[PDB]
Design an enzyme around this catalytic site. Structure first.
Site, PDB file in Angstrom:
ATOM      1  N   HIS A 179      61.252 -44.413  -0.213  1.00  0.00           N
ATOM      2  CA  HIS A 179      61.372 -45.997  -0.903  1.00  0.00           C
ATOM      3  C   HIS A 179      62.845 -46.824  -1.409  1.00  0.00           C
ATOM      4  O   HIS A 179      63.659 -46.891  -2.105  1.00  0.00           O
ATOM      5  CB  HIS A 179      61.418 -46.159  -3.065  1.00  0.00           C
ATOM      6  CG  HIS A 179      59.864 -45.675  -3.030  1.00  0.00           C
ATOM      7  ND1 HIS A 179      59.036 -44.518  -2.958  1.00  0.00           N
ATOM      8  CD2 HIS A 179      59.091 -46.645  -2.952  1.00  0.00           C
ATOM      9  CE1 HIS A 179      57.601 -44.545  -3.317  1.00  0.00           C
ATOM     10  NE2 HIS A 179      57.507 -46.473  -3.100  1.00  0.00           N
TER      11      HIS A 179
ATOM     12  N   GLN B 242      45.777 -36.642   2.784  1.00  0.00           N
ATOM     13  CA  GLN B 242      45.806 -38.449   3.527  1.00  0.00           C
ATOM     14  C   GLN B 242      44.492 -38.710   3.542  1.00  0.00           C
ATOM     15  O   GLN B 242      43.909 -39.929   3.379  1.00  0.00           O
ATOM     16  CB  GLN B 242      46.811 -38.071   4.702  1.00  0.00           C
ATOM     17  CG  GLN B 242      47.876 -38.319   4.184  1.00  0.00           C
ATOM     18  CD  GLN B 242      48.648 -39.286   3.604  1.00  0.00           C
ATOM     19  OE1 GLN B 242      48.220 -40.424   4.185  1.00  0.00           O
ATOM     20  NE2 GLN B 242      48.853 -39.649   2.255  1.00  0.00           N
TER      21      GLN B 242
ATOM     22  N   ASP C 105      52.154 -53.032  -0.060  1.00  0.00           N
ATOM     23  CA  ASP C 105      53.171 -51.971  -0.457  1.00  0.00           C
ATOM     24  C   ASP C 105      52.988 -50.669   0.045  1.00  0.00           C
ATOM     25  O   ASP C 105      53.169 -49.780   0.429  1.00  0.00           O
ATOM     26  CB  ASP C 105      52.899 -51.896  -2.196  1.00  0.00           C
ATOM     27  CG  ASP C 105      53.729 -50.951  -3.228  1.00  0.00           C
ATOM     28  OD1 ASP C 105      54.958 -49.935  -1.879  1.00  0.00           O
ATOM     29  OD2 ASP C 105      53.840 -50.765  -3.701  1.00  0.00           O
TER      30      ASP C 105
ATOM     31  N   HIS D 250      61.740 -50.199   3.444  1.00  0.00           N
ATOM     32  CA  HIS D 250      60.892 -49.852   2.475  1.00  0.00           C
ATOM     33  C   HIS D 250      60.505 -51.283   2.423  1.00  0.00           C
ATOM     34  O   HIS D 250      59.870 -52.404   2.703  1.00  0.00           O
ATOM     35  CB  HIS D 250      60.513 -49.277   1.455  1.00  0.00           C
ATOM     36  CG  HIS D 250      58.988 -49.262   1.542  1.00  0.00           C
ATOM     37  ND1 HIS D 250      57.929 -49.569   0.962  1.00  0.00           N
ATOM     38  CD2 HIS D 250      59.302 -50.095  -0.461  1.00  0.00           C
ATOM     39  CE1 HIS D 250      57.123 -49.223   0.196  1.00  0.00           C
ATOM     40  NE2 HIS D 250      57.790 -49.899  -0.973  1.00  0.00           N
TER      41      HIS D 250
ATOM     42  N   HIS E 119      60.914 -55.623  -5.293  1.00  0.00           N
ATOM     43  CA  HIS E 119      59.846 -54.697  -5.429  1.00  0.00           C
ATOM     44  C   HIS E 119      59.715 -52.943  -5.712  1.00  0.00           C
ATOM     45  O   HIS E 119      59.647 -53.096  -6.881  1.00  0.00           O
ATOM     46  CB  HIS E 119      58.743 -55.075  -4.967  1.00  0.00           C
ATOM     47  CG  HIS E 119      57.787 -53.916  -3.637  1.00  0.00           C
ATOM     48  ND1 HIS E 119      58.569 -53.453  -2.381  1.00  0.00           N
ATOM     49  CD2 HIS E 119      57.635 -52.592  -4.159  1.00  0.00           C
ATOM     50  CE1 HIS E 119      58.102 -52.715  -2.128  1.00  0.00           C
ATOM     51  NE2 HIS E 119      57.001 -51.934  -3.169  1.00  0.00           N
ATOM     52  N   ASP E 120      60.722 -51.995  -5.494  1.00  0.00           N
ATOM     53  CA  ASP E 120      61.523 -51.288  -5.835  1.00  0.00           C
ATOM     54  C   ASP E 120      62.969 -50.775  -5.733  1.00  0.00           C
ATOM     55  O   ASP E 120      63.320 -49.925  -5.623  1.00  0.00           O
ATOM     56  CB  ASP E 120      60.965 -50.422  -4.444  1.00  0.00           C
ATOM     57  CG  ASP E 120      59.656 -50.002  -4.161  1.00  0.00           C
ATOM     58  OD1 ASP E 120      58.768 -49.825  -5.582  1.00  0.00           O
ATOM     59  OD2 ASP E 120      59.393 -49.384  -3.190  1.00  0.00           O
TER      60      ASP E 120
HETATM   61  C1  LIG Z   1      48.833 -38.517  -0.485  1.00  0.00           C
HETATM   62  O1  LIG Z   1      49.072 -39.573  -0.221  1.00  0.00           O
HETATM   63  C2  LIG Z   1      49.947 -41.171  -0.841  1.00  0.00           C
HETATM   64  C3  LIG Z   1      49.675 -40.735  -2.524  1.00  0.00           C
HETATM   65  C4  LIG Z   1      50.223 -42.027  -3.067  1.00  0.00           C
HETATM   66  C5  LIG Z   1      50.672 -42.591  -2.859  1.00  0.00           C
HETATM   67  C6  LIG Z   1      50.692 -43.182  -1.059  1.00  0.00           C
HETATM   68  N1  LIG Z   1      50.917 -44.175  -0.546  1.00  0.00           N
HETATM   69  C7  LIG Z   1      51.447 -43.942   0.786  1.00  0.00           C
HETATM   70 CL1  LIG Z   1      51.791 -45.623   2.000  1.00  0.00          CL
HETATM   71  C8  LIG Z   1      50.427 -43.140   1.685  1.00  0.00           C
HETATM   72  C9  LIG Z   1      50.477 -43.208   3.428  1.00  0.00           C
HETATM   73  N2  LIG Z   1      49.777 -41.785   1.359  1.00  0.00           N
HETATM   74  C10 LIG Z   1      50.060 -42.203  -0.392  1.00  0.00           C
HETATM   75 MG   LIG Z   2      56.206 -49.170  -6.899  1.00  0.00          MG
HETATM   76 ZN   LIG Z   3      57.071 -49.707  -2.953  1.00  0.00          ZN
END
Ligand SMILES: COc1cccc2nc(Cl)c(C)nc12
Ligand SMILES: [Mg+2]
Ligand SMILES: [Zn+2]
Length: 313
Positions: free
Chosen positions: A68, A269, A217, A72, A106-107
């Site tokens: 973050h 994932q 995002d 990003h 945004h972050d």
């Molecule tokens: C369990 O994986 C996740 C959980 C919460 C947000 C996440 N955001 C991204 Cl972009 C990715 C690739 N994986 C996430």
């Molecule tokens: Mg956020």
């Molecule tokens: Zn973000």
């Protein structure tokens, strides 16, 4: 005044694609963003001195966390640029102005921890903002930078137009609260299916902009597999550090955040793509059809994650 930003041939071409990566050269990203603002909004929209002053202050207020971070921000902003370029006749002058800025901001000042960690730790920000803790802090940080001397990029705007652009930025930055995504996507899916979705309705526009914000995002899942695979390390580095911090508070973290459960990552994932990413890009594609390459690219990385579980890599 007659100055136009020019990217090297490869970047010039590739920047128009949804799966573009901004590369490892930090110093080129502000020029990349300025180029995006000029092609998406126009050379007129912002005073180049004020815009470049604003960009450096925003960069300055992004921490050196694994994921973050400033990279990003510029990536989330690029993904927004790609959407706005493939649907340019759908957005107002103000929306094109506000959305690239909202993505960049945004972050802002993200510490690398979730709203849950802030809540559990009893951080002051959790007392100041009950829900969307960080997201309300990010908008607060955006306003603080806009109020700095020589930083008001929306100076040319009228008193009313300034309040409209700031409200676009506010709603958009709050929309990046993944907890709110679920209900927003469910409401948008239903409105689209019953044909009731009208882009002339401001509350409907707000919802679509929120979905575009979740899409940008999470755009890490829409890049070519080597980029996605490497970005996942950064995402999990933050997750595991927060898991370690939950353990310090005497709380066993969720397996996603536990660094002793790294072997459960491909399955987690897979769950993420099924529960969040695929629904997000599907509904987005139903609403804005030229955003189909995001869903296509996302499905490819979902298949690559299945290959990972199967021992194919
Ligand atoms: C369990 O994986 C996740 C959980 C919460 C947000 C996440 N955001 C991204 Cl972009 C990715 C690739 N994986 C996430
Ligand atoms: Mg956020
Ligand atoms: Zn973000």
């Amino acid at each position: 005044g007659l100055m136009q930003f020019t990217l090297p041939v490869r970047l010039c071409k590739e920047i128009e694609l949804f799966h573009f990566d901004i590369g490892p050269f930090e110093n080129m990203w502000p020029g990349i963003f300025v180029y995006m603002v000029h092609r998406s909004c126009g050379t007129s929209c912002f005073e180049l001195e004020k815009l470049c002053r604003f960009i450096m202050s925003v960069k300055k207020n992004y921490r050196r966390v694994p994921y973050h971070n400033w990279k990003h921000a510029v990536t989330v902003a690029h993904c927004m640029y790609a959407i706005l370029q493939n649907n340019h006749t759908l957005f107002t002058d103000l929306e094109r102005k506000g959305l690239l800025i909202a993505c960049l901001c945004h972050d802002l000042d993200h510490r690398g921890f979730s709203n849950s960690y802030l809540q559990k730790f009893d951080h002051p920000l959790a007392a100041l903002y009950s829900t969307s803790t960080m997201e309300q802090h990010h908008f607060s940080q955006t306003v603080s930078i806009l109020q700095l001397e020589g930083h008001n990029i929306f100076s040319t705007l009228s008193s009313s137009e300034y309040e409209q652009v700031l409200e676009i930025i506010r709603k958009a930055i709050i929309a990046t609260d993944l907890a709110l995504y679920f209900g927003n996507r469910k409401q948008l899916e239903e409105m689209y299916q019953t044909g009731s979705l009208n882009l002339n309705n401001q509350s409907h526009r707000d919802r679509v902009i929120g979905l575009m914000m979740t899409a940008c995002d999470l755009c890490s899942v829409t890049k070519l597999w080597p980029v996605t695979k490497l970005t996942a390390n950064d995402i999990y580095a933050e997750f595991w550090a927060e898991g370690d911090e939950m353990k310090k508070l005497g709380i066993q973290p969720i397996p996603m955040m536990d660094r002793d459960k790294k072997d459960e990552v491909p399955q987690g994932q897979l769950g993420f793509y099924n529960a969040v990413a695929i629904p997000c890009y599907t509904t987005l594609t139903q609403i804005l059809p030229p955003t189909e390459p995001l869903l296509k690219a996302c499905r490819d990385n979902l298949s690559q994650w299945e290959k990972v579980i199967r021992g194919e890599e």
